[PDB]
């Protein structure tokens, strides 16, 4: 069978407070996990994940085909040319099992200067009808800000881990401008299950999502309690155990760039499981113009031979 990945449970609650030595001890655990498999579970995070799962289920199970077309991104609906990121990503019965809903910063309103300028990667969110989904928009926008707050705390820990002051990343992660997204992904139970929605890895593992690195600074993930993720290590792909009380955290390729691959973006994949489940990532993205000068925490002088890359350039290139 497959070996279990080392994915430690880190109590992140000190990152919300003012005990600086305790925060350093959290930062050390973040450093160790980031140098090993690249994954950890954040525990004691303060977010009501059971209610997130309930509200998400109520949405996924009640939205109708009509509503999905009305909310669809341009890949599924040619009438919606402004929807590249935000909206509904449809299933294709018989072919594509997964479906999802993506939303961006609630502050990206019609009057927001980056919306007025039509800057790439910025869009105004689309929402289902309030009478059909009562409370959903409000819940979802509040969730954005709850996970934003957890992510800001995690970014203080990553900064400390790397020998930086605790606002080194967080100062670029701001409510008025962050490019961060929430995706509410439904993986369905299907009988029979479409073979076209099952991919096969070179090692024979049946997959729902092939190997990749994340397009993010960090990724902050809730999943149901159905084991599915695997991480590539030197010892091969290893199983990430599920924990539906925690958030699974990893670095994305912008972190790898800034740190000269000291904190790698781990390669991971999703196993095929015929189970009704949820995958609810928050992609921690900075602002469009944010630039962090690359560095290397393994070199006496910290210098890297990588060129500065704005987050907007990174994101537009990555989302293709
Ligand atoms: C591994 C999970 C995080 C999940 N997959 C995913 O979320 C995958 C790979 S990280 N996500 C993406 O490709 C990027 C979505 C970006 C989003 N539309 C945005 O505009 O910001 C899954 O369960 O398949
Ligand atoms: C699997 C989900 C992340 C979502 N897919 C996506 O966001 C994929 C990721 S490469 N991107 C597009 O479709 C555009 C889906 O529901 O199809
Ligand atoms: Fe991923």
Numbering used by the authors: 3 to 322
Paper text:
IPNS is part of the superfamily of iron(II) dependent oxidases. Crystal structures of the Aspergillus nidulans protein5, 6, 7 show IPNS to contain the double‐stranded β‐helix fold (DSBH, also known as a “jelly‐roll”, cupin or jumonji C (JmjC) fold) characteristic of the 2‐oxoglutarate‐dependent oxygenase superfamily. These structures reveal the presence of the characteristic “2‐His‐1‐carboxylate” facial triad of metal‐ligating residues (His214, Asp216 and His270), an arrangement present in many non‐heme iron(II) dependent oxidases. Movement of Gln330 enables formation of a salt bridge between the carboxylate of Thr331 and Lys98, with the six C‐terminal residues (Asn326‐Thr331) taking up a position that extends the final helix (α‐10), thus enclosing the substrate in the active site.
Removing the seven C‐terminal residues to create the tailless I325* mutant provides important insight into the mechanism of IPNS catalysis, particularly the role played by these residues in shielding the reactive species generated at the enzyme active site during ACV turnover. Several minor changes are evident relative to the wildtype protein, including minor alterations in the positions of the aminoadipoyl and valinyl side chains of the active site‐bound substrate, and a small rotation in the side‐chain of Phe211 relative to the wildtype structure. Notably, in the I325* structure the β‐carbon of the ACV1 cysteine is clearly exposed to the external solution due to the absence of the C‐terminal helix that would otherwise cover this region. Furthermore, density consistent with a second ACV molecule (ACV2) is observed near the primary, iron‐bound ACV (ACV1). The valinyl and cysteinyl side‐chains of ACV2 appear to be well‐ordered, but electron density for the aminoadipoyl residue was not resolved beyond its Cα atom. Extra electron density is evident adjacent to the cysteinyl sulfur of ACV2; the size and shape of this density suggest another sulfur atom (S′) bound in the mode of a disulfide linkage. A further very small peak of density is apparent at a position that likely corresponds to another atom (C′) covalently bound to the additional sulfur S′. However, an alternative pathway is available in the absence of the C‐terminal residues, which would otherwise adopt a position that extends the final helix (α‐10) relative to the Mn:IPNS structure and enclose the substrate in the active site. Without these residues shielding the reaction centre, the thioaldehyde in 24* is susceptible to attack by a thiolate (or thiol) nucleophile (ACV2) from outside the active site, leading to an enzyme‐bound hemi‐thioacetal/FeIV‐oxo intermediate 29. The formation of 7/8 from reaction of the tailless I325* mutant with ACV provides direct evidence that reactive intermediates generated in this more accessible active site can be intercepted by alternative reaction partners and diverted from the reaction course seen with the wildtype enzyme.
